[PDB]
Amino acid sequence: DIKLTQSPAFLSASVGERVTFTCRASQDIRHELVWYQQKPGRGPKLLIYYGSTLEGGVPSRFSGRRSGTEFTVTISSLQPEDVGTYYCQQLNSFPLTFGGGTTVDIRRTVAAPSVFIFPPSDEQLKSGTASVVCLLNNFYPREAKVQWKVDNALQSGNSQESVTEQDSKDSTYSLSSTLTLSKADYEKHKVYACEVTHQGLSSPVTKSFNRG
Amino acid sequence: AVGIGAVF
Amino acid sequence: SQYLAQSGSEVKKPGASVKVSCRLHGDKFGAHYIHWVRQAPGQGLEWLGFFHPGTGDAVSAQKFQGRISLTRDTSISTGYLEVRRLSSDDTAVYYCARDKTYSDEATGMDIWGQGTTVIVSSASTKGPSVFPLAPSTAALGCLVKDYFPEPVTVSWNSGALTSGVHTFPAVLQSSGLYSLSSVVTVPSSSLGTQTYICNVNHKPSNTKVDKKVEP
């Protein structure tokens, strides 16, 4: 397999800022390289082929450049509709490999998440299970961390989380985390807390409750 | 680079 | 318009086989090469194979060789992707895509199908349980637990409440069942006064639940 190495993996910039990301082939692939743009929640779309050639419909803001085995795309001024993940693909030899992608988002002022904690419903407990949710709302830098503590004991492997795509309105992210215990286990402990660390926090915030 | 044969 | 219409979502058990279909509208089926590409949840793109829709000649990626087959039926302008001996690693959205086919060579995928999700799982179709996420500058929501397969849709007050709404990507529990939450942030002054209901729809199970979320 010819390997395509894309850098950086993630890229953030303001609207109207000039950006460039790179695709590097493990060996000469001539001009047989293509780019696809995948907007969030949608399918890939053809951007540039023959390494430098813009597909029809694609704005002049886009360009591409080949230097040897190194291929780059330049967006002269970044716009919100440019947001998504960019993949390069070599068409030179079988199999036709893909790069790992570069994910582009819009940079905004740093925003700390607003944190909320939800104890399980009495309804779920009847059923015999307890889900405790940690909400981290509207924080810009995508990177964020949750730690679950039960009577001040750090939990591992018993939780799951997911984060939204960048909100078009405020350019922020949100994250929800769920700690899931059996009803028997939930009732043996008092304090339930989620500890949040984020760039917008000079120190970690902890949200908690005592069941009962 | 690669082909699967000529179209027409 | 030239478009590619694919078959709908699938659920298959481990070890089973799947066959996806891709139909070309608006042009000659034999004029361009056609590719299959897949993307697993949270991962990147992966090339599977491509074929000559006129001749039937095809090439599959070495990784999948002997495990997949790419055919077509010219009478109906339709390509097919068969994947055998399925595992969890085969869960993905599978795309067919037309190649520009310049100079009788792979030039780039300029027309994409909408894709078909293929889920490899032992789970059987199950409607969700919906539990409130109760408030006490306030956040509330509903937890949508234990449903299969995706998707579900969530609205708030039948569509009247949009601003501040966040519905999260589902996560896959060890049970084979999905879980998601949907939250909304409202003025805390609204709490004892405004009524908040989340509307949950799961078509596979034909479940539609409306749950009123109060402090």
What CATH number does residue C39 fall under?
Answer: 2.60.40.10
Angle, alpha carbons A90-A96-A102 (nearest 5°): 55
Q: Give the integer Cα–Cα distance in Å for A154 and A207.
A: 14
The verdict on A84 and A154 lying in the same domain is no
The verdict on C18 and C39 lying in the same domain is yes
The verdict on A203 and A122 lying in the same domain is yes
With contact defined as beta carbons under 8 Å apart, do A38 and A45 qualify?
Answer: yes
Distance of residue A116 Cα from the nearest chain C Cα, in angstroms: 7
* Contact assignment for B3 to C104 by CB distance below 8 Å: yes
Residue ending a domain, among C99, C120, C141, is C120
Select from A119, A184, A190, A124 the least CA-distant residue to A152. Answer: A190
For residue A62, the enclosing domain spans 4-106
Q: Which residues contact C129 (CB under 8 A, 6 or more apart)?
A: A124, A127, C144, C145, C146
Whether residue A20 lies within 8 A of chain B, CB to CB, comes out as no
Which residue is it, tokens 């995948």?
Answer: A38
* Contact assignment for B2 to A30 by CB distance below 8 Å: no
Which residue is it, tokens 């070890």?
Answer: C15
The verdict on C31 and C102 lying in the same domain is yes
A-chain residue closest to C181, CA distance: A176
Select from A88, A113, A84 the least CA-distant residue to A12. Answer: A84
For residue C171, the enclosing domain spans 129-212
Query: Is the bond preceding residue C204 a cis peptide, omega within 30 degrees?
Result: no
Distance of residue C199 Cα from the nearest chain A Cα, in angstroms: 18
The minimal CB distance from B7 to the residues C32, C50, C106 is found for C32
* Contact assignment for C54 to B1 by CB distance below 8 Å: no
- Give the pair of three-digit tokens for residue C174: 């060890």
**Residue in A6, A135, A208 to test binding to C, most C beta-carbons within 10 Å:** A135
- Give the pair of three-digit tokens for residue C34: 């056609």
The verdict on C56 and C113 lying in the same domain is yes
Query: C196 exposed, middle or buried (CB, 10 Å; 0-12, 13-18, 19+)?
Result: buried
- Residues facing residue A104 across a β-bridge: A11, A84
Start-to-end Cα distance in chain B: 19
- Total domains in the fold of chain C: 2
Which residue is it, tokens 């001009």?
Answer: A31
A122: left (phi over 0), alpha (psi -120 to 50) or beta: alpha
Q: Give the integer Cα–Cα distance in Å for A103 and A92.
A: 24
Judged by DSSP in three states, C188 sits in: helix
* Contact assignment for C183 to A137 by CB distance below 8 Å: yes
- Give the pair of three-digit tokens for residue C97: 């895509």
- Total domains in the fold of chain A: 2
Resolution of the PDB structure in angstroms: 1.9
With contact defined as beta carbons under 8 Å apart, do A19 and A104 qualify?
Answer: yes
Within 10 angstroms of residue A199's Cβ, the number of other Cβ atoms is 14
Q: Give the integer Cα–Cα distance in Å for C92 and C47.
A: 12
The verdict on A166 and A186 lying in the same domain is yes
Whether residue A162 lies within 8 A of chain C, CB to CB, comes out as yes
Distance of residue C9 Cα from the nearest chain B Cα, in angstroms: 29
Start-to-end Cα distance in chain C: 52
Report CA-CA distances (Å) from A121 to A74, C129, C141: 51, 12, 12
Q: Give the integer Cα–Cα distance in Å for C51 and C33.
A: 6
Kind of pairing between the strands at A173-182 and A129-139: antiparallel
Q: Residue C59, Cα to own-chain centre: how many angstroms?
A: 26
B-chain residue closest to C58, CA distance: B4
Select from C59, C56, C50 the least CA-distant residue to C108. Answer: C50
Which residue is it, tokens 């479940």?
Answer: C207
Report CA-CA distances (Å) from C4 to C29, C97, C165: 10, 7, 33
Judged by DSSP in three states, C190 sits in: helix
Start-to-end Cα distance in chain A: 59
Helix locations, A118-182, DSSP H = 122-127
Residues of B in contact with C32 (CB under 8 A): 7
The verdict on A124 and A46 lying in the same domain is no
Query: Is the bond preceding residue A204 a cis peptide, omega within 30 degrees?
Result: no
Q: Give the integer Cα–Cα distance in Å for C79 and C111.
A: 14
Q: Per-residue b/e over C133-170, b at no fewer than 16 CB within 10 Å?
A: bbbeeebbbbbbbbbbbbebebbbbeeebeeeebbbeb
Q: Give the integer Cα–Cα distance in Å for B5 and B7.
A: 7
Angle, alpha carbons C71-C77-C78 (nearest 5°): 40
